[PDB]
């Protein structure tokens, strides 16, 4: 029944050589619906970043602790807490010492970006990633999680301030960046958000245009079953991939996936 | 139900399967760790042109039925042209 | 063509299964015993069947005749009619009641007029406006073989034996007259005789979880007992006057949603054997009168839209039927080839053979064959030798295009020789039969009689 | 007359900068992305060998084009000096017989309206060729225009399409199960589905003629030979 | 580690978790733990005029009171149980509205040793009587952010001990909420930072809110459910079904019911990728004695 | 006491304000206006033998009507003094449920949707027993809601829908050889077809009741010998 999980050509999810490419850059778009979670997918990409292979969907996940690896991994979120982060993605064993957890909701609200200038606290919300990476330059990946909610913290601010100030100089800095957001502002029933909620579509929109690969978790049609949660969906982004080798390219198929005590499992209609 | 296999031994304690995989059971002789593994796999016969008439057969404790296909469409509940084997049967293989 | 159903009625009484449980199974509305009490069991007697029979004061003759010559007037001609009978338990009456009905039915078309049912049928044979077959509806307490050798006498070709359920407390607590396993030889006694077997279900019932549902029809599939010819499917909807809605008041009794309800057929028509011919899921039912249950006007009309989203759509035959002539021939078809089944059922290997397309999965033509058992044949026919018996011949290839170079001028009229041919071959490699045997409607005694079959009894036959 | 008696001709010339066009417009979308189209002009543009400086500025891209020669970020300069550090790469309006550029905008979404006329006024000169795309599923904003009865002057599209002197529109050819409707709807609720941003796409071509009337076409490119073949 | 008090607690059923009680009937048994567990907040809503909703967010609050009042001198084991609910709200009224105990009853079978549980409640009877300051808070909601999430935390921080319960009632109410606060950044401000302090002290915090729905823009709703971990709706019966209902029901007056409810979100188990959404199944009803929950 | 009223004698009691609530809504287009309405009430209200006293709030009516027996203008006087001068006429007393003063409003489109509330939050008192009238065809101004990210803030008719305690809306009955669909397309058009302002008009009433539940009421009415009618 079950399935292998490939996302390139080379039969690898995360090809290795595009850490070993000097100058070059790329950008991945995951977007799910917020009646459910992705987090059984950023557990899979960290651990076949890490060790190399996806270690809890094809691979047993008893020994996953990836600290003090080679390698690295650096995740940064709004959504949730730095104690959050700790006490769950370590329950969930996420490595710790070579990685980097970064929290921007615990007390960062109370007076430490209200009531102060926009552009100091864009410059310092840079300014920590640009600080966090400068130890290990060319083997980590860095995912961030939701940042459009910064848009409606931010007193007034559009999508084209936001994203030049905080996107790009991302990862024109990192080698290879990650985003991940949910999609509810389109699956209002019976209300166009064209009428003018646009601003944050925009920023969807953009992303799309920029991103390199593009991952859909989607809920199941009309009804809710048992045997199966959702739908996974493999597009190829709006960049075209800024990798070395030729030959190369993203291979296009759908999955049924369903999730339990997390323990996720893939196949074919 | 088909009495498929059967294994021989002279002391038992347990006998535990396997939760991931399967066809791979537990059980111990004395003290002795023992893991067996099983397999499905069909009996055929030849199928080059010359004798070519697909005979299938199959085993039930001490008896083995045959069914040529191709010759006969018998189903698998009922079967054809047996024989009684004064003991059970782990394999079985046919001519050319 | 013209192809006829014309339903009839029988005069009002009492199953005798209610002798030894008190009353009528639980959920059978009306009855004479009833508020209406004129009128057959199951049958409110508000249905335009039940108008027209009442009308009458319940006639075979006046119904048949006044039913033949409305269909006839409305601008549809008529000269192919299958009469099915309904209500109640038919065999129960007397002896006379049955041969004068049966009689009678006969020579509304025939037009004669006369006594001795033997005549009847040889005149019946021999007429225009030929009769296809009839539909007796009888219980497992009357199917012996005394009673089957006066179906078989009468004309009849196929049976429907509902069953409801499998598990053995619902027996008795529904208050129906007889174990589940009984049905089993009822089906191996009857197929070997070949009259179609056809059965009835109800989803939910008292003390009936989804579960249980699920599984009794996924053993009623792969046990090779429960293996039949059709299939019916009534949800249960709740009328006032039924034993059913006494358990509701009682607050004894509750019913599922929607989505329940819908889930389950969808799963259930993901499972269909392919000769199996689902009849209808979204039956029909008096409906202001019912008090508990769901809509069921477009059951299938959802659970399609369910399988297209979880794929693995039905398989059975009314979907994939082409027909007799341009009901899909708007586009050209694809490659036709044979395909041919074996399975084991009740007590006998049965074959199936079809012309269907394979890329997109249409059906054109089907056969049934059975190779006769030793352990249930009783007839004089079928007890000197060997014998095969077709049990259903079902041409509608006589399609006049086709795919792959069909026959210009001569349109398809000897398709049906090659599955008849076909069928010889089997019986006289495979099988090793002495015999072979077709059972078919005393009207068209003759499309089979030009291929060298002669008759013996009311079976067409010849050896080997 | 005789001059381009068959569309493909007039579509080659175009493309290599045979005949001076002095500014052309493509329109895209999230459905079908408008790179292509500079691999056309790379391709095409160097068969009479354009290794003219192909200057590439840029609002929002993050990877440097290996098939231009110079690379350009605006992230950080205003309208005056866009226009300052831009005249010197390119052939400025001076030295009145000289030779002629490309210039490559990434994006047209990020700039206000209310000096799109003069970013082609102080530039346009009979040296340089603008080049750039328009997504059309970005809706712009107009929260500091505040659209109110008395404060009132036409959208972005209507003068896009009138100081342009050629028009190409960009479309994804339909190749599998999906067809237009569907397409939209999924777009609108962002699902995405399979059978998008494919390399073979289709071309809406409007070419504008002084005094007169101007032509329109359609056209079938592909993205692999480089080749082209006009609507039946 | 630091001294803490849990008025009561049991261990989760469905993960082996410490899980509370809302001391509703049927509530709490559909919250899928057989309780609400310490950490996760609560959302129920209301589709149209009535005021059902509203009882409930009486009964949380008054559950926490008895737990903590009839332990002194009156709980044998004495057991460490103390809350300091904080109410927001422009109108005290509640400080006058608690529901009276029926019977008692604590028991949970079918640092210390928690054994507490749900009580009996009756809505006719008030309560005998009603706690003091010291025992529970009032804070008008229309003072600027910064003041409440410094109070907040000072109140949490000076009585450690405690545990802690946070009430909101009927928040975004236009007769007490300015327009001035109706803008984005506010509300959604405040309640990101009151999830940083409730999770934050995840040992033994629980928030509970309620809105209503039918006269606030879906982005603003689409905004603010992301905030809480878990989304219950009630939407009352139409007109037309009533009349039906209390024309074909005539020998139960009981059995009528007000409306029908959706399960949207729930606690942790959602948080592992499970699609919990369930629509169109269950009946409401308020009650004499509490809030039922049944099957339709 | 009399409890589940016939829903015509129901209808006369609201009209006849046997029952009363502190704030009362009606809604009125450019089709069918409300000055008949008033005629209703007071028709209704002062045959019980009962004066009423009237004290009249105008932003669109011109002349002084014989209804009411004070009188104050506010075109030309703004909110920091309405706030003031409805108390003069107003005692803060209680019992709406009586003869007591009513506070009558001809137009509530021109006052700003932020400060509909603490308008209304000074008015409706004990005493005080007020009637308002809202245009459902007059867009409201575009600076009421700032279609700007930061407000959420609703619109006109949602709060007002949302605060008034009974809500009544009426509309014209064409007795012409027209369709209503010819009507909306005269009037986009500005074109007005003979039969507009009738006196024969239909009434639809919502009324907030038991915890909050409501029920909605539709008849037929005739203007000139008072006939309230099921339709
Ligand atoms: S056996 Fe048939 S006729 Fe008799 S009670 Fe049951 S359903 Fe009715």
Redesign the interface.
């Known amino acids: 029944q079950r399935q292998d999980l490939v996302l390139f050509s080379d039969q690898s999810v995360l090809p290795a050589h595009f850490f070993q490419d000097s ?3 790329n ?1 991945f778009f995951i ?1 799910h619906q ?7 997918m950023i557990n899979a990409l960290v651990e076949t970043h890490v060790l190399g292979s996806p270690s809890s969907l094809n691979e047993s996940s008893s020994s996953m602790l990836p600290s003090s690896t080679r390698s690295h991994a650096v995740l940064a979120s709004f ?3 730095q ?2 982060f700790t ?1 769950s993605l370590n329950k969930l064993k996420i490595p710790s010492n070579n990685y980097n957890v970064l929290d921007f ?7 430490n970006i ?1 009531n102060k200038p926009r552009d100091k606290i864009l410059s310092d919300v840079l300014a920590k990633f640009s600080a966090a990476i400068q130890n290990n330059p060319t083997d980590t990946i860095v995912i961030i999680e939701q940042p459009e909610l910064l848009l ?5 601010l ?1 999508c ?1 301030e936001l ?2 100030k905080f996107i ?1 100089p991302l ?2 800095q990192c080698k290879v960046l990650i985003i991940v957001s ?7 029933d019976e ?1 166009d ?2 009428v ?4 944050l579509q ?1 920023f ?3 992303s ?3 991103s390199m690969i ?1 991952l ?1 978790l ?8 048992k045997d ?3 739908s996974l ?1 493999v ?2 982004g ?3 991939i ?1 990798t070395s080798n030729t030959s190369l390219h993203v291979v ?1 198929n ?1 999955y049924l996936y369903l ?4 323990s ?1 499992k893939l196949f074919y ?1 | 139900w088909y009495l498929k296999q059967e294994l021989y031994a002279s002391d038992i304690s347990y006998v535990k399967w396997h939760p991931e995989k399967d066809f791979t059971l537990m059980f111990s002789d004395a003290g002795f760790i023992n893991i067996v593994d099983f397999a499905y796999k069909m009996a055929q016969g030849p199928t080059l042109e010359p004798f070519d008439n697909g005979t299938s057969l199959v085993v039930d404790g001490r008896t083995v039925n045959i069914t040529p296909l191709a010759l006969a469409n018998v189903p698998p509940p009922m079967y054809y042209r047996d024989f009684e084997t004064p003991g059970n049967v782990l394999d079985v293989a046919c001519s050319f | 063509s013209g192809i006829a159903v014309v339903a009839v009625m029988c005069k009002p009484h009492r199953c005798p299964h209610i002798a030894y449980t008190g009353n009528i199974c639980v959920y059978c509305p009306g009855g004479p015993d009833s508020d209406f009490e004129y009128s057959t069991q199951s049958y409110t007697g508000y249905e335009p069947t039940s108008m027209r029979a009442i009308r009458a004061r319940y006639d075979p003759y006046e119904q048949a005749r006044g039913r033949v010559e409305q269909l006839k007037q409305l601008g549809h001609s008529i000269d192919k009619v299958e009469y099915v009978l309904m209500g109640g338990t038919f065999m129960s009456l007397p002896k006379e009641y049955r041969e004068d009905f049966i009689v009678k039915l006969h020579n509304a078309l025939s037009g004669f007029n006369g006594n001795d049912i033997d005549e009847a049928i040889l005149y019946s044979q021999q007429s225009l406006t030929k009769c296809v077959g009839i539909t007796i509806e009888t219980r497992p307490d009357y199917c012996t073989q005394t009673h089957l050798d006066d179906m078989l006498k009468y004309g009849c070709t196929r049976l429907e034996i509902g069953v409801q359920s499998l598990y053995e407390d619902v027996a008795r607590d529904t208050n129906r007259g007889h174990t589940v396993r009984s049905v089993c030889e009822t089906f191996a006694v009857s197929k070997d005789a070949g009259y179609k077997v056809v059965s009835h279900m109800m989803p939910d019932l008292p003390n009936v979880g989804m579960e249980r549902d699920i599984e009794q029809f996924k053993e009623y599939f792969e046990n090779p007992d429960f293996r039949t010819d059709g299939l019916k499917i009534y949800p249960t909807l709740v009328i006032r006057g039924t034993g059913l809605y006494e358990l509701w008041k009682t607050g004894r009794y509750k019913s599922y949603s929607a989505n329940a309800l819908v889930d389950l057929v969808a799963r259930i028509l993901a499972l269909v054997p392919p000769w199996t011919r689902i009849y209808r899921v979204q039956r029909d039912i008096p409906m202001p009168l019912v008090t508990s249950g769901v809509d069921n006007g477009n059951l299938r009309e959802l659970a399609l839209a369910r399988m297209k989203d979880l794929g693995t759509t039905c398989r059975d035959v009314r979907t994939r039927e082409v027909g007799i002539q341009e009901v899909h021939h708007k586009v050209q078809p694809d490659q036709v080839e044979l395909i041919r089944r074996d399975y084991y059922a009740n007590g006998g290997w049965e074959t199936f053979l079809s012309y269907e397309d394979p890329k997109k999965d249409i059906l054109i033509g089907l056969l049934r064959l059975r190779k006769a058992s030793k352990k249930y044949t009783y007839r004089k026919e079928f007890t000197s030798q060997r014998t095969s018996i077709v049990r259903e011949l079902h041409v509608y290839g006589s399609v006049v295009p086709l795919h792959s170079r069909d026959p210009r001028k001569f349109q398809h009229q000897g398709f049906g020789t090659l599955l008849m041919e076909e069928a010889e071959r089997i019986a006289k490699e495979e099988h090793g039969s002495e015999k072979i045997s077709v059972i078919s409607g005393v009207g068209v005694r003759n499309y089979y009689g030009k291929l060298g079959y002669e008759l013996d009894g009311p079976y067409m036959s010849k050896r080997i | 007359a005789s001059s381009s008696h068959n569309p493909v001709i007039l579509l080659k010339r175009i493309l290599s900068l045979t005949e001076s066009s002095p500014f052309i417009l493509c329109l895209d979308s999230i459905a079908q992305t408008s790179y292509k189209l500079i691999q056309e002009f790379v391709h095409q543009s160097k068969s009479k060998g354009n290794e003219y400086p192909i200057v590439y500025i840029s609002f929002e891209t993050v990877n440097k084009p290996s098939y231009c020669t110079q690379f350009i970020d605006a992230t950080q300069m205003d309208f005056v000096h866009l226009v300052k550090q831009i005249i010197s790469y390119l052939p400025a309006a001076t030295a009145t017989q000289a030779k002629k550029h490309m210039v490559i905008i990434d994006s047209l979404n990020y700039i206000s309206t209310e000096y799109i006329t003069r970013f082609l006024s102080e530039i346009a000169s009979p040296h340089c060729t603008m080049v750039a795309t328009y997504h059309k599923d970005i809706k712009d904003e107009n929260r500091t225009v505040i659209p109110d009865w008395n404060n009132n002057y036409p959208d972005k599209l209507t003068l896009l399409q009138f100081m342009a002197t050629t028009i190409v529109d960009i479309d994804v050819v339909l190749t599998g199960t999906l067809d237009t409707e569907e397409v939209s709807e999924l777009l609108n609720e962002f699902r995405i589905p399979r059978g998008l941003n494919n390399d073979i796409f289709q071309l809406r071509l409007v070419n504008k003629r002084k005094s007169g009337r101007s032509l329109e076409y359609d056209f079938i490119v592909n993205s692999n030979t480089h080749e082209y073949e006009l609507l039946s | 580690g630091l001294d803490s008090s849990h008025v009561g607690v049991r261990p989760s059923p469905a993960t082996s978790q410490p899980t509370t009680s809302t001391g509703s009937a049927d509530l709490d048994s559909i919250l899928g733990h057989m309780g609400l567990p310490l950490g996760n907040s609560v959302l129920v809503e209301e589709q149209s005029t009535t005021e059902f909703h509203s009882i409930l967010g009486k009964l949380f609050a008054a559950q926490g009171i008895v737990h903590n009042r009839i332990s002194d001198s009156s709980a044998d084991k004495t057991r460490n149980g103390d809350t300091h609910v904080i109410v927001l709200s422009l109108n005290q009224m509640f400080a006058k509205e608690l529901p009276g105990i029926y019977k008692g009853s604590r028991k949970q079978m079918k640092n210390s040793e928690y054994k507490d549980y749900n009580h009996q409640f009756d809505i006719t009877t008030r309560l005998m009587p009603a706690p003091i300051a010291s025992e529970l808070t009032f804070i008008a909601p229309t003072q600027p952010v910064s003041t409440i999430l410094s109070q907040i935390e000072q109140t949490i921080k000076r009585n450690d001990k405690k545990l802690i319960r946070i009430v909101i009632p009927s928040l975004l109410h236009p007769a007490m909420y300015p327009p001035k606060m109706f803008e984005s950044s506010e509300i959604i401000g405040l309640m990101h930072g009151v999830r940083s302090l409730v999770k934050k002290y995840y040992e033994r915090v629980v928030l509970f809110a309620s809105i209503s729905i039918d006269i606030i823009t879906p982005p603003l709703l689409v905004l603010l459910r992301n905030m809480f971990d878990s989304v219950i709706n009630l939407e009352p019966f139409n007109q037309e079904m009533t009349e039906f209902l209390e024309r074909v029901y005539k020998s139960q007056p009981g059995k009528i019911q007000h409306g029908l409810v959706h399960i949207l979100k729930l606690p942790v188990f959602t948080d592992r990728g499970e699609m919990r959404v369930l629509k169109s199944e269950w009946a409401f009803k308020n009650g004499r004695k509490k809030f039922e929950i049944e099957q339709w």
Do not use: M
Request: charged share 15%; with cysteine.
């Open positions: 100058n070059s850059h950008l977007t917020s009646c459910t979670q992705p987090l059984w959504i949730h807490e104690n959050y006490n909701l615990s007390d960062f609200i109370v007076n209200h409606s913290l931010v007193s007034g559009t084209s994203n030049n790009t990862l024109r949910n999609s509810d502002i389109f699956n209002i209300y958000a064209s003018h909620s646009s601003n925009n969807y929109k953009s799309f245009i920029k593009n859909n989607n809920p199941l049609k009309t009804g809710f079953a199966v949660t959702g969906h597009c190829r709006g960049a075209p800024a296009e759908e999730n339990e005590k997390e996720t209609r």
